[PDB]
Design a protein around this ligand. Sequence first.
Ligand code: 5O8
Lengths: 14, 185
Amino acid sequence: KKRYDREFLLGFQF
Amino acid sequence: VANPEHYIKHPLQNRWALWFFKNDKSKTWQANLRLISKFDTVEDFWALYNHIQLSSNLMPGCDYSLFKDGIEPMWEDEKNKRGGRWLITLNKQQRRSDLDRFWLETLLCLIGESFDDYSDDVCGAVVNVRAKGDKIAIWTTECENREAVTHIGRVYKERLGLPPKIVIGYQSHADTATTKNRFVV
Ligand SMILES: *C(*)(F)(F)(F)S(=O)(=O)[N][C][C]1O[C](N2[C]=[N+]([C]C3=[C][C]=[C][C]=[C]3)C3=C2N=C([N])[N]C3=O)[C]([O])[C]1[O]
């Protein structure tokens, strides 16, 4: 249900 | 009211618990296993990851273990006893180049739920920091599920960017503690 892309997640690192 | 899109945390499908293993021979294996913290959002994941040490900077004999809330990083846990692990063998030169890169890709595969419906079969992951060679593995709930295990291992291999020449093996926990490959991709 709640899924995320790797490049979407990396944008929240900083 | 306020559009929650301006203030809300990005929630994950599962709550994840990070664990740490500090090698001490005076204590048993389980006594060395300790919990660090729990998160169930994207922001809280980076809040934890940024303030901890990379897998390459740990002492020899230390483990990071990211599992679903409720599942302990051992084979004797109900969710683990019937499954197995997709093992990745690294060498000494792959500590500098690949170790921290592969582990963060492994972390994103868990929290991001990248294996479609078979993300429910996934229990967790653990990185082993050893002087003889580093190891990374993704644990599943059932080794008998052929379709579930094969998809995770294939997609996991694609995410890390491993060449087709490199062959990785899925081995169950029941065979490891008694190693042979049940599946290979
Ligand atoms: C290592 F995998 F590197 F952790 S180890 O070779 O097993 N270290 C030696 C010592 O570790 C104990 N151990 C390790 N685990 C985690 C595990 C599960 C399945 C496959 C690989 C690692 C466990 C244990 N012991 C228990 N009781 N449960 C575990 O889940 C081993 O006893 C070994 O002697």
